Design a protein around this ligand. Sequence first.
Ligand SMILES: [Mn+2]
Ligand SMILES: [Mn+2]
Lengths: 763, 763
Amino acid sequence: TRGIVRGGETLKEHRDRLMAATKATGRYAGLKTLELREREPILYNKLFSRLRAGVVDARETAKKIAASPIVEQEGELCFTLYNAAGDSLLTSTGIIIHVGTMGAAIKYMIENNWEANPGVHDKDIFCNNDSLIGNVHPCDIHTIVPIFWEGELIGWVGGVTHVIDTGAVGPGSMATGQVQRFGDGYSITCRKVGANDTLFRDWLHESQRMVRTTRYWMLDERTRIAGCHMIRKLVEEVVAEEGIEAYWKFAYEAVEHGRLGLQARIKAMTIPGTYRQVGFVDVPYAHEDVRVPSDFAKLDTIMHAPCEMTIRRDGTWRLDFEGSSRWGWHTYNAHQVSFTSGIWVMMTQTLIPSEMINDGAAYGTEFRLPKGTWMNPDDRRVAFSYSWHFLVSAWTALWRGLSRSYFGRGYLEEVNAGNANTSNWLQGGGFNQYDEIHAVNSFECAANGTGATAVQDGLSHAAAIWNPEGDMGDMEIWELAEPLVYLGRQIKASSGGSGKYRGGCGFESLRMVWNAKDWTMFFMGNGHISSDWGLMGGYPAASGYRFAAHKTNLKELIASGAEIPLGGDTDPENPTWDAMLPDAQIKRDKQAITTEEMFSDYDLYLNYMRGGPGFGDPLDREPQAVADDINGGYVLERFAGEVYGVVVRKGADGQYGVDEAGTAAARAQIRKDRLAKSVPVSEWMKGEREKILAKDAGTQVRQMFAASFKLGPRFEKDFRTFWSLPDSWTLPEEEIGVPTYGSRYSMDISELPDVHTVQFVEE
Amino acid sequence: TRGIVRGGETLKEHRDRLMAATKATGRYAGLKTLELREREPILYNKLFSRLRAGVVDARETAKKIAASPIVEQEGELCFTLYNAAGDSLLTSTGIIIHVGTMGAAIKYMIENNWEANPGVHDKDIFCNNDSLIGNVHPCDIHTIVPIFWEGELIGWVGGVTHVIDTGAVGPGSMATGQVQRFGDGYSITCRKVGANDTLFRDWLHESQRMVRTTRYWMLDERTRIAGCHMIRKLVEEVVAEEGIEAYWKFAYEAVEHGRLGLQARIKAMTIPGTYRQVGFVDVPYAHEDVRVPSDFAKLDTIMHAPCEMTIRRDGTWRLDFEGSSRWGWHTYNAHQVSFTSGIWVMMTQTLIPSEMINDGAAYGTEFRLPKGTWMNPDDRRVAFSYSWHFLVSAWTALWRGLSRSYFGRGYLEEVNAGNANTSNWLQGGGFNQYDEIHAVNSFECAANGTGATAVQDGLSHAAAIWNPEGDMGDMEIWELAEPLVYLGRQIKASSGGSGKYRGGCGFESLRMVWNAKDWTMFFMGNGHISSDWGLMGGYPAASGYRFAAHKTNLKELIASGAEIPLGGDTDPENPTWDAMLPDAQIKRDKQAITTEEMFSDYDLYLNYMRGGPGFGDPLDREPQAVADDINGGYVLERFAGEVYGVVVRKGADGQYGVDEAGTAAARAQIRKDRLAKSVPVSEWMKGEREKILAKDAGTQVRQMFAASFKLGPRFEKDFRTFWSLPDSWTLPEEEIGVPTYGSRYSMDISELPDVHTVQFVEE
Ligand SMILES: [Mn+2]
Ligand SMILES: [Mn+2]
């Protein structure tokens, strides 16, 4: 029975052959030479130039079909072209993390003999979003079309859209509320959803009633299908015009070219050696306003992600996450594919922007993700809807590590202290201004600030780790899809991390609920803990907080001519809105994660997008920059002196200027205070060691270590050595008093029948 | 192109033709005469006898394929045979409410042009459980196979199994936790799940990872498929032996025969006139241990289900539920198909046992269910997982109403005061004794007690409204599938409703958690309110309560030989176990509905199945019966005197005997006390009327009326008339202080694209 691949081999035989060559030889598919590229270089780039333009243009055109602004204006969609074995050749920009996620679904089909059943046929249509096979979160939905030529498969197209909602318990796309997979939303596992280019009615009727924002989902489906088919047609025209021979060579030489590309850029931009760095984020599920149904999920915890980054003389490199913490009862878990494609999107943004963007760099990187950590769970009950919470707090560390190598070597233009927490996600549900069931999810946190450089300040309100082409979207467009009105949009002062170069500031949006019925809202970002750290000096960006006002009496206040709250929440420590709202129930605290809360018309919700970390000692910053930050609204005048040692005087014009003698003398005095207030690290260490031996820390600090030691013995060994702790000191998780469900017992997806999962990671 | 039905017409043309004949003519399909039955009655019964044997025997055989005891021992499975238009011809016994649910699924396909897409092809396999189309709850999963003959559809087979769990937020089948459809478990809308008699791999992988109890679910599929295919093969053999002409006549004359049967039985057993009755149950979501994520769902409420039953001189009859309450944010909502097939299952149990069991009676009954009530919701966010809560408390009223017509006419053998609340459902989830993810759901409440008769006492621990073939299942078999050990099984004293004839007692099961890991449990029945009422006298059965013991210290108690709790909780007002467990956290209260709660090995959970209501004035009971009840454990000795006026004396043997002279005087004395403590109803009425005018009642009493008034103007008009209330007195729901989400705004499933829903009810 002939296999369907161009060879006559099956999908499985074909890929198994290619991975064997790759393993044995060290080069993708065994390609020790690139025949087309070396011998017919003109033909090689013409294919590259024409096909990469095709997918770029497909994404840009098709996104005019969607109703949701996330797809139509922000561009949270991607199109990828794959070879037979599910390796990408080329991609449009956008949410390119799904280069790898959709590649792994293609491989899951390959490895579980979809070929025999349900069959991969021409004109078929597959839809998938299953996180257990490596997708980021259910709200990101794939369409996958096989491409055939003269009767045989020659590759695949994938299209991803980020969809408003998938019917989880939480109303929104990064939803809280649910604590397991069951309730985490509509989960599609590589389903055959069409044949002969036409969708199945039983998929249409079932799928559309599993969600709130049906019209939005329906159109997000057509944006995918139209893109896939523009790309399928593109390929056929390219093959018919240049030949299957060349196309077939290109479909694999391109992928080894991407591996060759990563190696060469490492060797030219980096330094061999070892780099160590760590990242944390908070999960405050103890609080009253995280109302979750399962009692075993109400505890505070901290995500712990240490990375040992090894860079070798031959230009390979290794990322070891030994020491990391366990998955939990929340929606912040991830998958080994999620995680590693995340690290790949980062190398598309600094290491290989000017090389082939495809799975080549993936084959040139080594990943060790211990089984059972949050980044590699071993449990099929796990939940995913806001994977970015953990994911974006782990990858930010690696910017710093990678930036020390550019800095030592002299490529200071490339240093970057890391990504912002891509957060607060305005979410809610109910009846909207068209009186339809609806959900919300602002992609304003596509435009957080970004890490400072060794050369200049980070960009404000500019980007996210998962899409560098930032877009905040127009106020006038968002108000077509949410039942809220804007009372402010404002640069978020003192959100940027301080330094010689200041991190990018976030921004803020103040909303009034308007024309909503039976409406709820919630918040979802980091509160207690800043994920990014500064670099070579350099402080973390600000962390998160919440602001909601209920019963504002704002109908009367608007109408009677009284003061009403406008703009941003400029100094949350000295607020101005609260005085204006004497009757309101104001929620102003650090609890940056909540579940659904009744809101009504004229209630208030502050949307806050985070800043980025800074670079260098702050009192090396040029004083004039500090003064300009004060006028430009970037830094509150209070910290000009307290952080930068800059003394500013207001001119007749009302703007701030530099007092130079004052600024020098204040900097001189800060240096003596630093000497006087610090102590030798020897001294501090024996103090902290006493606290450790006494087990003096909150339950969430003690749980992070207990769980981390159990998954990563080399990390426990290192902690014990560092603090010089007796073997009599032990930290069993079960002694901390907090629930410990899922700490010993777990069941993996691979323990279910007929499941063959693909491994991409050392594990 | 040509339709698929044996005629050459499409499914839709075929049914549309037949429903028009039925509307114009008053007889199913226009059959004013029954050709086969009148002309070849021998051939007519031979087809009937062989086919009903086939479905009975198919259900019986295939249930030996299941691992879950729900299907294998208790038989909560059903097989039904349908004509082309989706009308049942015959059924096996068991959970026959799905006669109507699978018929409504077949008809939904007919109306939405499944024929065009995805196509109804021979050898195909459909799977469905969608409650918006009229299924009881997600856990009841249908398999639907078309039957073809010489290339044309001649009917369908449906198979139903109750599945342990479908991946709702709650672990169990009657799950709490979720408050909307989103989270209420895996919802399949008439999916084509196989072709050429083989299941699709993408359905297999996806479906098995959306639930906990996977191996159980897998085998429940094979039990369904096998029964369908035994029945498809059966028909073909019957047709090949007797001819398509005869079978095609039978497939429709059978259904008008059933309508004729309902009419003849009404006219023979009943009295024409009007019957009025009502039913209630509790929903105290206000309590701390109902932890739901949505703040708009935390309130107490009461289901209000009034029925005006009209029986006519021509033998038709009408059931109007005007006045009923609204659907809510819980899992107790229903659907018009759910509700009406319930009343049909009830009429199979008294009215037509000896007639054709098929849709004939459905065509002979009139139903009016106001749109927007809990029984006919107009909102597609609604949740269903424990529909029986409302459903079984509504139908019990109709037994009483129907019983007054037997009692007046003299068929006292047929009187029954109503069904028990079929409840408490022991449920929970975690890791079981085989160290696999698992969920539990005891079907011990298939064997509640039943209503007393005009002739004799109700049966104890015997049946449920949805399956009169009660089975409590073996202890030894239940312990193969739950990580619990039985410490007692006991008739539940004083659970039966008191009367001249006592209602049936429930029973109770005391469990110890054993060999469980990361384990939770919860409760799900009625607490505050008894659904059934007694009759012509007659008190309701006991209502519900909860008992759990945590930290029992029972390992130590067992090992040391101290007292351990065994058996049942004989007198909850004077317990013996609580003293035995001095270290325990004991939960003993009325809160019969909880969400998930951590349990551990040696903790205790009491499973309580309810009793049935009684008949007649209790102090007409033969005193000897009261004495036997006391010894037999049915009634606690305290109430012999207080309820029955029976004075019982303990003998030399230790058993109770009747004090005859004492019992006469006590009965003489009770009658004088009854006079002395009652008042003229006029007197009592003006007191209660002041309370109404003063709005003196719990928020749950005031919300039940507010919601009912808005949905049922004739009920408000009638309330106001009865209590003589000014037009100045008004009860707006929004003044009661509790959330009112979904009270004005709603969006029906019929408002989504391409949705054509079928109407079976006056509405
Ligand atoms: Mn997304
Ligand atoms: Mn069921």
